[PDB]
Amino acid sequence: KLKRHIRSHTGERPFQCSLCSYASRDTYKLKRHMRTHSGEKPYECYICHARFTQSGTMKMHILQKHTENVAKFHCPHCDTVIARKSDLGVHLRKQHSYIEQGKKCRYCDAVFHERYALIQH
DNA sequence: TTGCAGTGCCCACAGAGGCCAGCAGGGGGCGCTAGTGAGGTGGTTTTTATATGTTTTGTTATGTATTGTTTATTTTCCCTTTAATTTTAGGATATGAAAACAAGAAT
Ligand SMILES: [Zn+2]
Ligand SMILES: [Zn+2]
Ligand SMILES: [Zn+2]
Ligand SMILES: [Zn+2]
Question: Mutating residue 84 to Q has which effect?
Answer without folding.
Answer: In a Wilms' tumor
